[PDB]
Design a protein around this ligand. Structure first.
Ligand SMILES: [Mg+2]
Ligand SMILES: [Mg+2]
Ligand SMILES: [Zn+2]
Ligand SMILES: [Zn+2]
Ligand SMILES: [Zn+2]
Length: 157
RNA sequence: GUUCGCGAAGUAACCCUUCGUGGACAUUUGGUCAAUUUGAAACAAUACAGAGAUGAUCAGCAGUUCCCCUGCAUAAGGAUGAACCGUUUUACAAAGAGAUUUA
């Protein structure tokens, strides 16, 4: 029941046909992303992986707004879309929290993985990174987060 | 972006939107590493040389070196694995004899 339809898979509920054209359009953008473009550069190669983290994030904001913001789908369709692995359950669970409404991924708040026990730089608000920049006179030595290619996922931002 | 409070607007049995404000929430990724010739795989082929002792042909096993390869290996193999089988003058005098030689 995660991804391919088997006999143990339950039939889809009512509102799935109206959301299915957008979910098919995310699905074919991942297939172009999965394939290897033969890239010599190390900086181009993780740039391809950032497209996968973004395409994953956007399809989960799609199902999140349909149920928690617009209420356009029944809960029986939402429980089906979680079990059939359309929407990332643990990512939606942070989006419900306060301060985490626009979080890019779960790997960027995971403190144990960092050298310093900190969050990712993409979690720091753009007002604050501009401030110590004014101390130095140099703008920003930060463009994209190494694990996501996130330009800053903070709430105020 | 959410939420709490505040100040207004319009709708208004004070409710719904919208604008202006205070506080809260959330807080510093990654690299010892840049994408062909100029910071360092190897082999095969070719050319030369030829794989111990001995009168001669052979089983080998060691030790020594700022020598290794194969192997999980403290096993066993790798020409008995390889390189060593070259060069070597003073802790130095005692005894005597001749000759030279000087107060
Ligand atoms: Mg030997
Ligand atoms: Mg041997
Ligand atoms: Zn992230
Ligand atoms: Zn990040
Ligand atoms: Zn981020």
């Amino acid at each position: 029941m995660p991804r391919i339809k088997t006999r143990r898979s339950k039939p889809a509920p009512d509102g799935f046909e109206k959301i299915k054209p957008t979910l098919t359009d995310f699905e074919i953008q991942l297939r172009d992303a999965q394939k290897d473009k033969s890239s010599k550069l190390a900086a181009k190669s993780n740039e391809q992986l950032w497209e996968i983290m973004q395409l994953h994030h956007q399809r989960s904001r799609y199902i999140y707004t349909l149920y928690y913001k617009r209420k356009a789908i029944s809960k029986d369709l939402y429980d089906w879309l979680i079990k059939e692995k359309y929407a990332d359950k643990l990512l939606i669970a942070k989006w419900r929290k306060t301060g985490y409404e626009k979080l890019c991924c779960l790997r960027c708040i995971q403190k144990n993985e960092t050298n310093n026990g900190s969050t990712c730089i993409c979690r720091v608000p753009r007002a604050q990174l501009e401030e110590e920049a004014r101390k130095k006179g140099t703008q920003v030595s930060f463009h994209q987060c190494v694990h996501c290619g996130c330009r800053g996922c903070a709430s105020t931002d």
